[PDB]
Symmetry: D2
Subunit: 391 residues, 4 copies
């Protein structure tokens, strides 16, 4: 049962040492009592024995066990933030002459890592429509090494048909590493590894931390891919600090109570918006009619609270300020996943610049909301005062 | 004056806000009061204005200003540890078809990053002897992009002639990026940027933190190289957590009192060892006769406390255990830079495996010591009981 | 304001958050004055949220304090290193040689032991009352009574006071008494103590406000009448909490609503199952009809937390107690409560009798206290059922 | 053992460090018992370094405690949220209605205010003595004296007690008194209080032990005679410090030697320059010949820290005070001390007279207190010289 799992994940006695939570073990240097102990630790340095702080301390091991239990993985590799998890996960499997195939709705810095960093290293990238399903075979090349998914999509929220994509890819390039950015689902609302994906990546910064303070990336790997991701990321010096690891473990405890509120509130806002005279479209995976809703309903076991909607109007600069500057409860900021509700605008032309080898199909201003833990009726009231400012 | 600089570096009122130390600002999301504020922050997102936690908060900005003041740089890029600083600094400047030229005494994982990661990306690496000076021109290729220095060298402690190397490299491949791992000198005992080096990298984990807890890498850049390092590392998601940034700033405060004790103690141990019947050689940059001592004396303004010595004996496994297992005051561990004295052994054949395109010239067991803050006469007593165990 | 929106926003003024969502963490003893004039200004405002000296607080403390005054409707919020320090020092701040303290006999045992072991040797006497005494409290008032100390629900046995009756009765006789409550079970928020004419609402913020069993902190939210005295006398005893703890307590507030609702829903479901169970004598849950003071809870509170107790039909012997407690898979044995993890503790009737001064107990089986956490309620009920099979 | 080696290793047993160099940080209220038997064992040892409940401490606290007993030669180390809480609560733990407390009139002002404002209303009287009274202390002892409270060097004015004389005199008359000292200036280590027959050595660990002006914490290291009473009575008041603060205090110990030596060397160099300066009346530095109790410092201490004061030839008026203090570049205005940053504070003779009960002051110019930090001593002297040019 997810709730019981969340409360206990990673809390082995060897990590908590008489406490409820794991200990916080801050270290670089880790001490070997003897030559024989150093040899034991060296052989087990990637197997949960204390060796050197760059490999982890007890605090890290505890979070790694929790993430493996929650996402059904063989191992969990840690990073200083989600963008570092994305970039280094992809790097760990590529070589000069490879091709990367990425959804055109991937998080922008994931796109930019490929276009700006991988391109100089003899790796080419191309893109696909998130709703392509089994027709992704037209984009597969004999040198396709990575197939990178993000479901729902960044900003626009399109849900992939992961089963269809996975079957297609294994049929043509079975050696491909299939990755997903599974941040929206907090890794627990969509069990990526059970669907044939090799690596489930999170900006743990978001719903796993849950409070908008700490930054951390995770990559949960199947047994086929764990060693290579782990050792190559180690060679790039990737790790997260012990205290952040502790705080992430601690976020897990309330994840189920938080995600149920996020689902209930954001769906009710989405439903209210969908019926509002000033709204063109609502992009929420849980809302019937949204792009790939059917796949959300079949493949996920809940929703989080991030979604977007498109205004009937393309707001001009003065309207955009009147709208966004006068919110009482929604704050303007990047990221999401916390207790506080947030708001961000993107003009159609902003989104057009980040959908390579696609076409946008809306013309009004796109508003993305993260629905936090405030009373939902207060949030709806704030949104409705917003609409009066731009009617 | 270094001491006064250390106490005040980065402590602008905008960062301390009424306290002695900088504030600890934990954040991912950073809030914009208005559209106009978001536009201001966006334009200044790499210029010390609050934008998004991946770019930093006030705590990071404070440490970045301190590191720029201390090392004379245009900018300071932050990483989750030294190995991540090395790997990502080199990555930020390379492209398929480049050559990297690295001292054969570089830190092993720096070697391994090149041999195991860069090699798959169409980048070749070769090596040089640390004492090559101006004859490094024989190793320069028309596609040499990076010249990577580490002075003193890892484990064996050889000091380069940086002036001679730098002049040679600028004369042949002026477009090269010259980097140094300046960890031993804590960035302050050798002012790398004043000698023509482009980027001074530290495992800030070591002497800057000073207490063996926290892990962090720094790269202080000149104005020529700052933008590219900063933006490419950003694309790999490199950052450090706020609290670690705070603790690093805090280590700086005692760095001068610590480094003076480390120098005085370790030189006196080195002198005592050099005269000991059971010692073949002592490798300490401050000790006359050590490899590149003359360059240490001309180019550095002090010593830290890490050095090595070679035993007359190649200890067998039983002797190695009798030696290392029965120390009272020295602990066995990786890393160094803290208050606690540490000891590590390397057999000649271990070092031979990590000196590409060189030759070792010793035959006894090499012992590396980090000399901490304990009474030096107690440490010497512990070393002498050690010698009695293996006579 | 609606609780959940209030919780999210409490304390988060721009002067404390400085561009972030959460307050800054400002760690300091020394706080720097730019000038003689600035120092004079800070000195005047040293108890009024200007930076002065770390013992008085930093911006991190100020934020928590603001949050706590907002949520509990107070003029001020005094901070302490734990619950027990808040209790002991809030009582100390208002007494003097010759005073009498009247305390509920269901008070947390350390609160009792402070009165009987510390206050006694300072010329302050204490006596105790039954938690259901209500209006009849007048019977225990003395000419020198200074403090009337309430705890509702009761420690372990969970009895709810008729607060309206008690407060009216006290004010009718000793209007100038200081009325305090230990309002930890309600998290200060499910029972608005200061709206009921209580002077000081004290919590072990250790519990529900922190919510994760990993920081310790006490709070005392005061009305305007009593704030100064509590604050300044507490300061002379050196009482403060660390900035990092204050930041984590503020943080815990943000999930307090979603957590309390799950604790209510799950704990009531367990309590309802236990009441029907053949091996259970009685269930002590404020929200469960038939428990002591339930109708006062229904009337006076806006919700329940997850802590309650039940009485077994058996008085367990030592071997049965071990076989019961040692073999749980989901409940852990520990003190405290208020966190995400379910906890269990046992007391024998004779242990409880010993901490019920000037009153008698009302049960004879072993008493089991549960903290119902965030685990799936059916897994928890399954673990409790395996427990019962072990002592049939 | 030699101090620097001791400092590095103090508290770092394998049971606390668990493979790291520093102790673990174990954050907890609830501490889990695996069984009834384990709980019974923890309960017996709850004041003896077995995990029991976070109010009693975690492994992090145990480590600090061990370190502090080792460095100060004590049987036990009681922890508090700050210096002022250690003073107030250590005095409280040993008094009862009818007792008398004898305190040096150079005691930290809050220590004085605790006695005169809190203790007075609890039936405890206080009187004061001159710090140089030595053997003549017998003159101020009373049949009901319970505590003799020492502070050496003195707060602000820096007078050093003849501790050997005072202690012998007290023991000759009231052998069962509790003798306490506020040993913060010495960092517990430059004056081994418990070796001189003092019962309790108290510090504001806030200062030199933490060493960076960013955590607050008090300690009281006790002999075997007084440990239990201090510990248990302090516990009934809820006194504890947070685990993270305990970890940072242990951490500060590791650099205490290298820091104190620089504070000694730099502060003595400044003091020697000031004594020769035409605008200075007198220098109050324990290490500087001619200061009050210097010869007791030379005899009894093993070093100096960096805090001292000096008296200007001028009694500065308000405009000269601002022009002096407002325009420093390296010294900052703030309370506290013990950190890496140099600090400056001013007091007028009439402010000091007001906190010197039952004694008189010995100066008439403005009194300037300096904390000499880790900055280059010649830059510091240059900043002080520019200061003098501003009030010529
Ligand atoms: C799906 C997704 N995957 C990765 C990342 C990168 O994580 P880190 O910020 O922790 O490096 C993000 C970041 N997104 C916000 C900044 P926003 O969505 O506001 O741009 C994301 O949304
Ligand atoms: C010169 C030098 N430069 C980089 C690094 C990498 O820093 P991080 O450990 O913080 O990633 C090291 C690490 N060295 C120790 C593990 P050791 O020397 O014990 O192997 C080093 O020595
Ligand atoms: C109502 C109530 N009021 C105060 C305190 C004291 O708070 P601190 O533990 O933060 O000092 C407690 C403590 N209770 C547990 C230890 P337990 O209930 O397990 O004995 C309490 O329950
Ligand atoms: C000797 C001495 N003993 C105790 C304390 C109280 O410690 P805490 O501030 O940690 O509660 C002090 C405090 N002193 C500064 C505030 P200042 O000297 O600047 O007034 C002191 O000096
Ligand atoms: Ca808000
Ligand atoms: Ca040691
Ligand atoms: Ca459990
Ligand atoms: Ca300064």
């Amino acid at each position: 049962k997810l709730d019981t799992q969340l409360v206990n994940a990673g809390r082995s006695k060897k990590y908590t040492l008489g406490a409820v939570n794991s200990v916080i073990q801050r270290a670089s240097s880790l001490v070997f009592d003897s030559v024989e102990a150093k040899k034991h630790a060296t052989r087990n340095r990637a197997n949960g024995e204390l060796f050197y702080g760059r490999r982890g301390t007890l605090t890290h091991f505890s979070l790694q066990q929790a993430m493996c239990e929650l996402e059904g993985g063989a191992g969990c590799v840690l990073f200083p933030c989600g963008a570092a998890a994305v970039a280094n996960s992809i790097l760990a499997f590529i070589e000069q002459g490879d091709h990367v195939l990425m959804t055109n709705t991937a998080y922008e810095s994931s796109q930019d890592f490929c276009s700006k960093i991988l391109s100089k290293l003899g790796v080419t990238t191309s893109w696909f429509d998130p709703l392509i399903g089994a027709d992704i075979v037209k984009h597969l090349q004999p040198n396709t090494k990575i197939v990178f998914l993000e479901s729902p999509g960044s900003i626009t929220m399109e849900v992939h048909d992961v089963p269809a994509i996975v079957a297609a890819v294994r049929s043509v390039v079975p050696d491909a590493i299939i990755m997903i950015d599974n941040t929206w689902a907090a890794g627990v609302l969509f069990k990526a590894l059970d669907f044939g994906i090799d690596v489930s990546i999170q900006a743990a910064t978001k719903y796993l931390v849950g409070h908008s303070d700490a930054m951390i990336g995770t990559a949960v790997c199947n047994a086929r891919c764990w060693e290579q991701l782990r050792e190559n990321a180690y060679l790039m010096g990737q790790m997260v600090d012990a205290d952040t690891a502790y705080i992430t473990s601690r976020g897990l405890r309330t994840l189920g109570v938080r995600l149920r509120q996020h689902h209930e509130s954001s769906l009710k806002v989405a439903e209210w918006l969908a019926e509002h005279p000033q709204v063109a479209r609502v992009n929420h995976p849980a809302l019937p009619g949204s792009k790939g809703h059917e796949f959300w309903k079949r493949d996920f076991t809940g929703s989080s609270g991030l979604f977007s909607f498109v205004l009937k109007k393309k707001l001009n600069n003065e309207e955009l300020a009147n709208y966004l500057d006068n919110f009482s409860l929604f704050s303007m900021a990047y990221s999401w996943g916390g207790y506080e509700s947030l708001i961000l605008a993107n003009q159609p032309e902003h989104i057009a610049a980040i959908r390579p080898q696609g076409e946008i199909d809306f013309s009004g201003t796109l508003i993305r909301l993260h629905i936090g833990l405030e009373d939902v009726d207060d949030l709806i009231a704030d949104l409705d005062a917003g609409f009066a400012r731009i009617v």
